[PDB]
Design a protein around this ligand. Structure first.
Ligand SMILES: COc1ccc2c(c1)C(c1ccc(Cl)cc1)=N[C@@H](CC(=O)NCCCNC(=O)OC(C)(C)C)c1nnc(C)n1-2
Length: 127
């Protein structure tokens, strides 16, 4: 078990926007989660080699992480906010799929997801 290529963060063929909702996802949502004490496991793709998780990419076929989301937002990769919200939800779900209830990493994901939900509850109406 090598690592897979990371998710795409650059693709000139993909149409792009910078909507007020996407600006909120960067300035409020990503920034709030990134600074949290429990962000670090999520700030880059899972390194299955260094973590000795040879089954990780056997189980997880839609990897996602906040490093990827941060690059997507900074590079204006998205067309809409729903695409970015889906990336956050994929990241949390992958953690819950791979790990066991009550594991430390699951507790970390749950704490970040609570904050994520609190912030996207106030996603502004698209202008
Ligand atoms: C860069 O470091 C990363 C990156 C990603 C991680 C993890 C670590 C971390 C991470 C884990 C604990 C804490 Cl406190 C924080 C993180 N979790 C991985 C999944 C994983 O490694 N599972 C091994 C399970 C083996 N059990 C284990 O060793 O338990 C002991 C025996 C009590 C020590 C895992 N699953 N999803 C993610 C994200 N991650």
């Amino acid at each position: 078990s090598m690592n897979p290529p990371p998710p795409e963060t650059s693709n000139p063929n993909k149409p792009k926007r910078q909507t007020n909702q996407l600006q909120y996802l960067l300035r409020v949502v990503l920034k709030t989660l990134w600074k949290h004490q429990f962000a670090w496991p999520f700030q880059q793709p899972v390194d299955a080699v260094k973590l000795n998780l040879p089954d990780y990419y056997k189980i997880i076929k839609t990897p996602m992480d906040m490093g990827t989301i941060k690059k997507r937002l900074e590079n204006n990769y998205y067309w809409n906010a729903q695409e970015c919200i889906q990336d956050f939800n994929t990241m949390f779900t992958n953690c819950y799929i791979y790990n066991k209830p009550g594991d430390d990493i699951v507790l970390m994901a749950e704490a970040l997801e609570k904050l994520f939900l609190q912030k996207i509850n106030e996603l502004p109406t698209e202008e």
